[PDB]
């Protein structure tokens, strides 16, 4: 957004996250043995899913794969959900030990309310496309139209590229997996459990397919990544 400051020829080239295939190219590129068993291509699609296409953390990841085995690679894949990015924090071509020190700053610069919105988007399902009303439940605000959730969730995606806007089929945002496990081991352990419950309230009223408005009352489809959140908040 620093560009609204200018009045000029402003042209943009956006660096998106590395596609599932480029990650392959990148691995082959720095000496990585490619899978054979099915549960080896899966080890690597897990890493690629977790570090939601991210050059820097992918890099700490290879650099931290010590024996080079697919095995110790899935070890790191374990190490990643249950100790956060700190399981793979390393000396890297990046000036920073782990991706959390970088996103750090990005969160500090943030509008105070956006700091809030962000702090709560923990209590979501990661790598899942989900509607504005499903966000109006955990996200704060100072009536009957909650688009304000959307202005905030947009500023949040423009400014460190933390969310992810996707216009149709229906107006939905998304938190990636790296941009989430940052928030896991970083927000106040309480505000997680407050979001799970403050969610389970609105949670009742009267695959490549979005969750229909006939089936929102049950977020239980995503029970797994919530059981992981309640098990977390109770340690």
Residues 191-210 that bind other proteins (CB under 8 A): 191, 193-194, 197-198, 200-201
Does residue 101 interact with other proteins by CB under 8 A?
yes
Does residue 217 interact with other proteins by CB under 8 A?
no
Helix (H) or strand (E) holding 77: helix 70-81
Q: Which residues contact 198 (CB under 8 A, 6 or more apart)?
A: 137, 138
* For other proteins, the closer CB: 75 or 191: 191
Q: What would the two tokens of residue 210 be?
A: 């979005």
Peptide bond into 102 cis (omega under 30): no
Does residue 133 interact with other proteins by CB under 8 A?
no
Binding other proteins (rule: CB under 8 A), the pick from 188, 215, 221, 223 is: 188
**Sign of the CA dihedral running 20, 24, 26, 32:** positive
**Cβ 18 to other proteins shortest distance, Å:** 23
Q: Pick out the residues of the known binding site for ATP.
A: 92, 94
* For other proteins, the closer CB: 71 or 200: 200
Residue at token pair 């996200």: 139
4 within 8 A of 37, measured Cβ to Cβ = no
Q: How far apart are CA 146 and CA 149, in angstroms?
A: 6
* For other proteins, the closer CB: 80 or 107: 107
**Cβ 234 to other proteins shortest distance, Å:** 5
Binding other proteins (rule: CB under 8 A), the pick from 107, 121, 124, 134 is: 107
């Amino acid at each position: 957004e620093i560009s609204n400051a200018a009045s000029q020829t402003c042209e943009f080239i956006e660096v998106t996250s590395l596609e599932i295939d480029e990650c392959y190219d990148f691995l082959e590129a720095y000496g990585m043995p490619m899978p054979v068993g099915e549960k080896e291509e899966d080890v690597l699609n897990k890493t690629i899913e977790l570090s939601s296409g991210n050059p820097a953390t992918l890099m700490m990841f290879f650099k931290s794969c010590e024996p080079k085995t697919f095995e110790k690679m899935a070890q790191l894949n374990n190490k990643l959900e249950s100790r956060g990015l700190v399981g793979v924090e390393c000396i890297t071509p990046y000036s920073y030990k782990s991706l959390a020190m970088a996103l750090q700053r990005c969160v500090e610069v943030l509008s105070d309310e956006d700091r809030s919105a962000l702090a709560f988007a923990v209590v979501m399902p990661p790598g899942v496309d989900i509607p504005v009303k499903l966000w109006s439940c955990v996200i704060p605000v100072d009536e009957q139209l909650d688009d304000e959730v959307a202005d905030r969730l947009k500023r949040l995606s423009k400014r460190g590229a933390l969310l992810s806007g996707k216009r149709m089929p229906v107006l939905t945002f998304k938190i990636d997996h790296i941009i989430h496990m940052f928030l896991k081991h970083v927000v106040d352990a309480q505000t997680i459990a407050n979001g799970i419950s403050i969610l389970e309230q609105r949670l009742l009223e009267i695959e490549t397919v979005i969750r229909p408005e006939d089936f929102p009352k049950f977020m239980q489809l995503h029970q797994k990544f919530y059981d992981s959140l309640k098990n977390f908040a109770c340690c």
